[PDB]
Design a protein around this ligand. Structure first.
Ligand SMILES: *Cc1cc2c(nc3c(=O)[nH]c(=O)nc-3n2C[C@H](O)[C@H](O)[C@H](O)COP(=O)(O)OP(=O)(O)OC[C@H]2O[C@@H](n3cnc4c(N)ncnc43)[C@H](O)[C@@H]2O)c(*)c1C
Ligand SMILES: C=C(/C=C/c1c(O)cc(C(=O)OC)cc1O)CCC=C(C)C
Length: 503
C-alpha cells in the first residue's frame, strides 16, 4: 500500500540535497538526531516506535516538501521542536511516520524598539531568553523556566512561568505566527485567519499544521528582580501553615510575585517530606521581604535567602547555575510519568497531608509541584486562547515520578501505577467536569482518540471530547470547528489530536 521507497524518492527529489536534511535508518546520525531531543527517556528505547526518516528542515520548502510527500504516500508527520512532550507525541506514533525536527529553525530576531521578536518555532526557551537579554535587560517574554523546551510546543500548549501572573501565558503574548497547513501553504496570522491563529496558541498545533515561527510580544521587566529557592521541613507546623496560606494567597498576592512549591520525600532510616519554595519576584528584595512579611511570615524567608539579579539571570538560578554565563542557556535526562490538576478551592490540611503521605512510597523520585495562578491570569478570558483555566482556578498541581531508564517495563508499570493511584486519590479535591488538565502536561491517561475505528466523525468528536474538554473545557468545540475547516481530511493527527467534523 504505502510504498516507503516511493515516499523516499518523493522526498529526495523535492528536497534538494548541502546540509543534510533527510536522515534514514542506515544514516548513523539518524539515531543521535532522534535521541538528542527525546526528553522522556521512556520513549528512547530501541523498542519504541521509530520514524521512517527524520527531516531537519532549514527552510520552509523542506517542510512543504515533507507535507506534500507524506500526504501523497500516506506517511504521518510528527513535528518536533524541543522534544519535551510528556508522552513523546513529537517523535513516536503507532503508524508509519516521519519526524519534522525543527532544531535548525531556531533563528530569533529581537527588536527592542517594537518590543517584539520573530522566533522560529525550533528555538528553545533558553535561546529566546538569551536573545532577549542580548538586546535589553528590561525586556522579557512570559514563558517557562526549562531552557531546553521548544518554543513551538510550549506556546502551542499555552506556556506558563514566573511572569504568567503578570502577563499571562506565552500564548497570550503572540502577535503573529507562520504555519504550514495541510495544503502546504505558508500562512501567517492574517492569511491563516483569527480562528487558526487562536487554535495554535494553546490548542496543540500538531492538530492543525506545522508552526514555523512565532511573533512574540516582549514585555518589560525591571533591571533588578529577586529570586529565592528555599527548603523547609513539612514536619514543622510553620511550614504546614505556610502551605495552608500558600493555597489561599499565592494566586492573590502582588502580580510581581510567583512562588512555586515542590514536595518530595528524603531518607535507622527515617523518611521526611521536604517542602521547597522557589520564586521570582519582579522587583527589589526590600519590597519582596515586606510583601513576604505581610503575606507569608510562615515561610520565615531570610534576606540572605534572596538573590537580586537581572531578569534573564533568574533562569540560571532556577536551573541550578549558581556558580556561569548566560551562554549556558544556548545549550539546547530520565524517564518519567507526570499527571496534573487544577485546584479551584483550597485542599483541607488533612487531605493535603494524606496526599503528601503518598510520597513516602517514592523517596527521591516523586515530586508534587504547586504553581500559583491568579493575577493577570484572572483578567484573561477563558476563550482568549484555547487554554481555558483562568479565573476561578487557584493553582496548578503537578505530580511526577521519575526513574532511570533501563528498559524494564515492570519498573515503569510500578511507577505509573503509583502516580495513577495518587491522581485517583486527588479526584474529589481538584477540578471536575471537566478534570482540568494543562495541555503542556500531556497525559494520554485522560483519554485518547479512536485508532481502531475512526469512520464516524460524530464518534471521533465524542471520544475526543473526553480528553478534549479536560485540556480546553468549552474551547474544545471551536477547536473542532477550526480542525474541520483547516484540516478536514485529518492529515495532522496524533493520539490526542482534534478530530474534524466530516460529512
Ligand atoms: C520537559 C520540560 C517541559 C516543560 C518544562 N517547563 C515548563 C514551564 O516552565 N512551563 C510550561 O508551561 N511548560 C513547561 N514544560 C512543558 C512544555 O511546555 C511542554 O512539554 C511542551 O509541549 C514541550 O514543547 P517542546 O519542547 O517543543 O516539545 P515537543 O515534543 O517538540 O512538542 C510538544 C507537542 O507540540 C507539537 N509541536 C511542537 N512544535 C510544533 C510546531 N512548530 N508546530 C506544530 N506542532 C508543534 C509536537 O508535535 C507535540 O505534539 C521543563 C521541562 C524540563
Ligand atoms: C512552570 C511549570 C512547569 C514546571 C515543570 C517542572 O517544574 C518540571 C518539569 C520536568 O522536569 O519534566 C521532566 C516540567 C515542567 O513543565 C508550568 C506550570 C503550568 C500551569 C501553572 C498551568
Amino acid at each position: 500500500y504505502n510504498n516507503h521507497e516511493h515516499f523516499l524518492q518523493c522526498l529526495t527529489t523535492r528536497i534538494s540535497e548541502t546540509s543534510p536534511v533527510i536522515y534514514t535508518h542506515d544514516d548513523p546520525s539518524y539515531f543521535t538526531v532522534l535521541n538528542s531531543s527525546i526528553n522522556n527517556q521512556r520513549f528512547s528505547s530501541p523498542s519504541a516506535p521509530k520514524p521512517f526518516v527524520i527531516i531537519t528542515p532549514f527552510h520552509a520548502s523542506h517542510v512543504q516538501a515533507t507535507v506534500f510527500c507524506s500526504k501523497k504516500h500516506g506517511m504521518q508527520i510528527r513535528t518536533r521542536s524541543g522534544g519535551h512532550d510528556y508522552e513523546g507525541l513529537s517523535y513516536v506514533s503507532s503508524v508509519s511516520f516521519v519526524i519534522i525536527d525543527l532544531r535548525n529553525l531556531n533563528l530569533i530576531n529581537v527588536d527592542v524598539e517594537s518590543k517584539s521578536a520573530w522566533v522560529q518555532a525550533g528555538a528553545t526557551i533558553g535561546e529566546l531568553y538569551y536573545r532577549i537579554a542580548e538586546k535589553s535587560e528590561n525586556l522579557a517574554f512570559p514563558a517557562g523556566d526549562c531552557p531546553g523546551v521548544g518554543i513551538g510546543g510550549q506556546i502551542g500548549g499555552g506556556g506558563y512561568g514566573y511572569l504568567a501572573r503578570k502577563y499571562g501565558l506565552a500564548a497570550d503574548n503572540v502577535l503573529d505566527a507562520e504555519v504550514i497547513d495541510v495544503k502546504g501553504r505558508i500562512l501567517d496570522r492574517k492569511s491563516m485567519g483569527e480562528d487558526l491563529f487562536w487554535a495554535i496558541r494553546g490548542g496543540g498545533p500538531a492538530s492543525f499544521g506545522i508552526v514555523l515561527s512565532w511573533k512574540l510580544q516582549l514585555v518589560p521587566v525591571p533591571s533588578i528582580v529577586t529570586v529565592f529557592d528555599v527548603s523547609r521541613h513539612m514536619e514543622d507546623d510553620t511550614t504546614k501553615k505556610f502551605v495552608h496560606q500558600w493555597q489561599r494567597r499565592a494566586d492573590k498576592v502582588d502580580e510581581d510575585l510567583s512562588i512555586y512549591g515542590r514536595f518530595q520525600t528524603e531518607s535507622n532510616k527515617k523518611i521526611v517530606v521536604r517542602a521547597s519554595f522557589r520564586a521570582t519576584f519582579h522587583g527589589g528584595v526590600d519590597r519582596l521581604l515586606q510583601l513576604m512579611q505581610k503575606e507569608f511570615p510562615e515561610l520565615g524567608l531570610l534576606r540572605q535567602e534572596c538573590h537580586e539579579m537581572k531578569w534573564a539571570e533568574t533562569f540560571l538560578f532556577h536551573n541550578n547555575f549558581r556558580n556561569s554565563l548566560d551562554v549556558l542557556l544556548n545549550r539546547t535526562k530520565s524517564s518519567f510519568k507526570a499527571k496534573s490538576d487544577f485546584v479551584k478551592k483550597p485542599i483541607s490540611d488533612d487531605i493535603f497531608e494524606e496526599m503528601l503521605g503518598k510520597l513516602y512510597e517514592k523517596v527521591g523520585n516523586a515530586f508534587i509541584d504547586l504553581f500559583p495562578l491568579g493575577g493577570k491570569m484572572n483578567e484573561i478570558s477563558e476563550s482568549a486562547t484555547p487554554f481555558p483555566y483562568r479565573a476561578g482556578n487557584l493553582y496548578n498541581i503537578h505530580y511526577l515520578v521519575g526513574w532511570e531508564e533501563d528498559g524494564n517495563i515492570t519498573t515503569s508499570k510500578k511507577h505509573v501505577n503509583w502516580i495513577r493511584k495518587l491522581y485517583n486519590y486527588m479526584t474529589p479535591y481538584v477540578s471536575k467536569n471537566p478534570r482540568a488538565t494543562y495541555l503542556n502536561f500531556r497525559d494520554l491517561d485522560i483519554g485518547t482518540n479512536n485508532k481502531d475505528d475512526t469512520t464516524s466523525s460524530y464518534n471521533n468528536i465524542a471520544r475526543a471530547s473526553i480528553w478534549g474538554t479536560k485540556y480546553f473545557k468549552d474551547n474544545f468545540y471551536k477547536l473542532v470547528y477550526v480542525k474541520t475547516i483547516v484540516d478536514p481530511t485529518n492529515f495532522f493527527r496524533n493520539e490526542q489530536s482534534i478530530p474534524p467534523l466530516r460529512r
